Amino acid sequence: GPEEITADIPNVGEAALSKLDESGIVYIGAEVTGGDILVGKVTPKGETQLTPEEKLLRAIFGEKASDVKDSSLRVPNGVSGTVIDVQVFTRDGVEKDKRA
Amino acid sequence: DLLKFLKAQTKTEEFDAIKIALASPDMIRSWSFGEVKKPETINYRTFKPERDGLFCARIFGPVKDYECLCGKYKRLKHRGVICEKCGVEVTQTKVRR
Amino acid sequence: KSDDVNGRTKMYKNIVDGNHQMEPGMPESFNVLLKEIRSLGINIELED
Amino acid sequence: QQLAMTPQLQQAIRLLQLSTLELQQELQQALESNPLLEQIVYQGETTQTLQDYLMWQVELTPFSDTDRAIATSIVDAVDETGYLTVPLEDILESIGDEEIDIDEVEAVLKRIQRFDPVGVAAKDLRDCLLIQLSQFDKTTPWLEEARLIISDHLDLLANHDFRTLMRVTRLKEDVLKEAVNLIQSLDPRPGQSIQTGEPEYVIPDVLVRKHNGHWTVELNSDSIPRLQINQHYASMCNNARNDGDSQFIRSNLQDAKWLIKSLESRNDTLLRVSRCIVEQQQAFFEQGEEYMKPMVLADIAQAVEMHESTISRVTTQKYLHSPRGIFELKYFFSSHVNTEGGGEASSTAIRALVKKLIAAENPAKPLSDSKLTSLLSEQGIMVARRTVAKYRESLSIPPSNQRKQLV
Amino acid sequence: DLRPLVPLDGGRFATSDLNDLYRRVINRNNRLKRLLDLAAPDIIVRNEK
DNA sequence: TTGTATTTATTGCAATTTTCGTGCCAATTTCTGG
DNA sequence: CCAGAAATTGGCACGAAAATTGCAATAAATACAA
Ligand SMILES: [Zn+2]
């Protein structure tokens, strides 16, 4: 499957997702520092085999958290500034998000 | 005894001179751990090294610490064991250097 | 401070423990050079 | 007629069902044995993994030699998600010293479990959650209830009972919900903080795109296999030399000429099959997989006047790239169920509909299979309850009683 | 590990110069072995050598 | 002009095995009314 | 609140249908020597 740009990252806390909009992209005018998330992205890692351990994990914590990684864009260390512009380029035939 | 095994791999070689000469074919064969027969490097389907290729695990060693290629032996309790299916020794992955 | 892999980790542990001593060892680039010279069909080795 | 079926036609047919990588391997193998065939600094950076971080913390911890060996054994048996993959008896065996009991291994494991991240090297989920909960201060409002639930009743929490849990734990809805939320605020996989790896891609065999208001399908020229005749060896074919030398070249020239034609025919057959598939499943490439049509091998086998065996062989392990994504060219063949009035509905479309309907349900009361069947039997589809259950199981979705939540 | 492959974005596992030279040597050696096995005419095996 | 050796063209049948949807029914899960 | 029922779920089965896999040495077009 494809990589998804979204704000619903399971492993990160609620504070680190405060600067992202509904599309998983940082707001315009946000003051960011090194390590902050700018674009939220997840990479699939799903597989058919499911041990009882995976069943317990999915039952307790939900299915969204599993079968997904975290490959978000972060501010490089020692870099700060203000978000003044965001540009989104989408391939033809792909559904556009709200930000675009 | 795991203590001696872990202590032995940090030992430094003692020497006082460097010798250079020509290499006999027998010398070159004694250096090697196997013969490379195919020009393949990576499988690109399982993303594992091809057998008898330029990156073969049976010749140059494991790609992960103390694991054989097929996956029968995986931990330190099987260290030094040559797998009978894939032929990969269960040892450290730095032997590929 | 360089390609000697084991001494790198020994020195950090010694410094954190307050012991300012090192065990030098052998650089890795010399081993790389030995392997590259051997790949040319030349028998170069350390003795004693 | 039954064709002729020479040992050459068998190899020509067998080329159809090989993927591009296996086909390249076969081409190389045939290339190194036929002289007249031919084909047309960086070092990197070291990355720190979870085990490297754990060993770095082990080196800077006041362990003894025996404790350090035990810690090395423990860190060796830790997977990418941070869980211990072997029992402590295996670690004790791997130590190799007979004067060590299980208590020392337990103490070293307890010390390691407090490394960064906390909860790493845990035996199971209950142990990891208890380790993470033991680092919270006592001032947490609902620490004791969450600890009780995790320690004693976790299987029926996974079963989503939420009612027997009330009876056994003797709590209220406004407190049990807070305890459950506190539990769900914990980190299930401690070892995923350090993520190392790379996604793995594929090279598509055929590309379908939209040009000036229609769909165009063409082979991917960056991976299409092609061979060539060696002219230098072909020149010295009938010249003045030994008769055996001249006979060795004619046979190999014939073999090379046949192999090139077999490759070209394989490419042409693949292109025609892909073109027919794209023409048949035209609504899918525009409106998603809720509109996929139920076609089989015999449907394509009449539009190209081939046999079903050829269509089966061609579509094996060959990937198609579309604006929607990468598929396997056999993802477009599916079963069907009867609809209302007349027609057929594909199983892929029904799976998409089931996923959409389940994703838009009331969390308090999830939709059972009978309710899902009733909802589907309003759009025209006639699918049985057992079939809907099978589709839900194939989608890896828990039953209704395991999808409800206390909210 | 002294001649590693370069992984880049998009999954391109490009090869280095030493791996290319080794591949050329191995291909020529395999073709020559097969030709010597099959008793090819001398005019071809000389070119391969 | 004609029988003959060479080079193309051949990419399907027929078994055998797998998968399909949907019914039967025992074992769990929730609901209800007394 | 306690039975008893009503509902839910998944293993096994069935006959059709679909998909897979093993075959092993032919027929005609064409250049050619009598
Ligand atoms: Zn093995």
DSSP string, B4-69: HHHHHTTPPPP-SEEEEEEPPHHHHHHH-SS-------B-SSS--BPTTSTT-HHHH--SSTT--S
For residue D45, give both structure tokens: 């950076």
- Separation of alpha carbons D312 and A70, rounded Å: 38
The DSSP string of D328-397 is -SSTTB--EEE-SSS-EEEHHHHHHHHHHHHHTS-SSS---HHHHHHHHTTTT----HHHHHHHHHHTT-
- Separation of alpha carbons D64 and D97, rounded Å: 14
| Contact of A60 with D188, CB cutoff 8 Å | yes
Q: Residue D333: helix, strand or coil by DSSP?
A: strand
The separation between the first and the last C-alpha atoms of chain C, rounded to the nearest angstrom, is: 27
| Contact of B60 with B66, CB cutoff 8 Å | no
Q: Is the dihedral of CA A36, A42, A47, A52 positive or negative?
A: positive
Closest to D96 measured CA to CA, from D66, D134, D127: D66
For residue E31, give both structure tokens: 């073709």
Closest to D53 measured CA to CA, from D92, D82, D94, D90: D82
B touches A, CB cut-off 8 Å, minimum 3 pairs: no
Work out if D328's Cβ lies within 7 angstroms of strand G.
no
Interface of B with D (CB under 8 A): 1-3, 6, 39-40, 43-45, 47, 65-66, 75-77
Q: What CA dihedral angle connects D228, D232, D235 and D236, to 10 degrees?
A: -130
D284 contacts: CB under 8 Å, gap ≥ 6:
D291, D292, D293, D324, D332
Q: Is the peptide bond before D117 cis (omega within 30 degrees of 0)?
A: yes
CA of D52 relative to ligand 1 center, distance in Å: 24
Work out if D251's Cβ lies within 7 angstroms of strand F.
no
> Other C-beta atoms within 10 Å of D55: how many?
16
Q: Rounded to whole angstroms, what are the CA distances from D89 to B77, D101, D128? A: 11, 10, 20
Residue listed under structure tokens 């891609």: D201
Q: Residue D316: helix, strand or coil by DSSP?
A: coil
Find the largest Cα–Cα distance for chain B: 49
Work out if D161's Cβ lies within 7 angstroms of strand F.
yes
Task: Please state the φ and ψ torsions of residue B19, each to the nearest 5 degrees.
Answer: -115, 140
Buried b (16+ CB within 10 A) or exposed e, E10-47: eeeeebeeebeebbeebeeebbbeebeeeebbeebbee
B41 touches chain E (CB under 8 A): yes
CA D399 centroid distance within chain: 23
Task: Please state the φ and ψ torsions of residue D48, each to the nearest 5 degrees.
Answer: -95, 120
F1 C1' to C40 CA distance, Å: 72
Cβ distance D21 to B44 less than 8 Å, yes or no, reads: yes
Work out if D322's Cβ lies within 7 angstroms of strand F.
no
Angle between helical axes of D173-184 and A52-61 (0-180°, round to 10): 120
CA B2 centroid distance within chain: 20
Single-letter amino acid, residue A46: G
Q: Write the residue in D32, D35, D42 that is nearest to E44 by C-beta.
A: D35
Task: Enumerate the residues of chain E whose CB falls inside 8 A of the CB of residue D41.
Answer: 16-17
Work out if D260's Cβ lies within 7 angstroms of strand F.
no
> Other C-beta atoms within 10 Å of D179: how many?
23
Q: Rounded to whole angstroms, what are the CA distances from D76 to A19, D79, D209? A: 39, 8, 49
DSSP state of D103: H
Number of H helices, E strands in chain A: 1, 6
- Separation of alpha carbons A41 and A39, rounded Å: 6
Give contacts of E 1-49 with B, CB under 8 A.
1-2, 5, 13, 15, 19, 22-23, 26-27, 30
Q: Residue D95: helix, strand or coil by DSSP?
A: helix
Write out chain E in H/E/C secondary structure: CCCCCEECCCCCEECCHHHHHHHHHHHHHHHHHHHHHHCCCHHHHHHHC
The separation between the first and the last C-alpha atoms of chain E, rounded to the nearest angstrom, is: 30
The DSSP string of D216-258 is EEEE-TTT---EEE-HHHHHTSSSSS-HHHHHHHHHHHHHHHH
Q: Is the dihedral of CA D289, D294, D297, D301 positive or negative?
A: negative
Residue listed under structure tokens 């032929």: B87
- Separation of alpha carbons D259 and D307, rounded Å: 22
Task: Please state the φ and ψ torsions of residue D127, each to the nearest 5 degrees.
Answer: -65, -45
DSSP state of D117: S
Single-letter amino acid, residue A72: S
Residue listed under structure tokens 């795109």: D209
Angle between helical axes of D143-151 and D173-184 (0-180°, round to 10): 70
Which residue approaches F14 most closely, CA to C1'? D2
| Contact of B70 with B82, CB cutoff 8 Å | no
| Contact of A38 with A71, CB cutoff 8 Å | no
D219 beta partners? D206
CA of B82 relative to ligand 1 center, distance in Å: 8
G7 C1' to D370 CA distance, Å: 10
Q: Rounded to whole angstroms, what are the CA distances from D402 to A56, A59, A63, D125, D368? A: 12, 8, 12, 19, 11
Q: Rounded to whole angstroms, what are the CA distances from C29 to C44, D311, D325? A: 15, 57, 46
Deposited experimental method: cryo-EM
Taking the CA of residue C48 and the nearest CA in chain E, the distance in Å comes to: 26
Annotated binding site of B for Zn(2+), which residues? 68, 70, 83, 86
Domain ranges of chain A: 1-100
F19 C1' to C19 CA distance, Å: 71
Number of H helices, E strands in chain C: 2, 1
E40 contacts: CB under 8 Å, gap ≥ 6:
D35, D248
- Separation of alpha carbons D393 and B31, rounded Å: 56
Note the strand F nucleotides within 7 A of protein beta carbons.
Answer: 7-14, 20-24, 29-31
Residue listed under structure tokens 């845990």: D122
Taking the CA of residue C1 and the nearest CA in chain E, the distance in Å comes to: 21
Q: Which of residues 384-403 of D touch strand G (CB under 7 A)?
A: 385-386, 389, 392-393, 398-401
Closest to B40 measured CA to CA, from E15, D6, D371: E15
DSSP state of C45: E
Q: Is the dihedral of CA D363, D368, D371, D375 positive or negative?
A: positive
> Other C-beta atoms within 10 Å of D116: how many?
11
Residue B82 sits at the vertex; the CA angle it makes with B78 and B88, to the nearest 5 degrees, is 105
Cβ distance E13 to B39 less than 8 Å, yes or no, reads: no
| Contact of D77 with D91, CB cutoff 8 Å | yes
CA of B83 relative to ligand 1 center, distance in Å: 5
CA of D197 relative to ligand 1 center, distance in Å: 23
Task: Enumerate the residues of chain D whose CB falls inside 8 A of the CB of residue C28.
Answer: none
F28 C1' to D125 CA distance, Å: 26
| Contact of B76 with B3, CB cutoff 8 Å | no
B42 beta partners? B49
Note the strand G nucleotides within 7 A of protein beta carbons.
Answer: 7-12, 18-27
Q: Is D248 exposed, middle or buried (0-12, 13-18, 19+ CB in 10 A)?
A: buried
- Separation of alpha carbons B82 and B68, rounded Å: 8
Taking the CA of residue E37 and the nearest CA in chain C, the distance in Å comes to: 27
Task: Enumerate the residues of chain D whose CB falls inside 8 A of the CB of residue B47.
Answer: 200
> Other C-beta atoms within 10 Å of C15: how many?
12
For residue D201, give both structure tokens: 């891609």
G9 C1' to D380 CA distance, Å: 25
Chains near D, with 3+ CB pairs < 8 A?
Answer: A, B, C, E
Buried b (16+ CB within 10 A) or exposed e, D41-50: eeeeeeeeeb
Taking the CA of residue E11 and the nearest CA in chain C, the distance in Å comes to: 28
- Separation of alpha carbons D301 and D103, rounded Å: 69
Residue listed under structure tokens 């800077």: D60
Residue listed under structure tokens 């060693």: B61
What CATH number does domain A1-100 carry, 2.115.10.20, 2.40.10.120, 2.40.50.150, 3.30.530.20? 2.40.50.150
Q: Residue D157: helix, strand or coil by DSSP?
A: helix
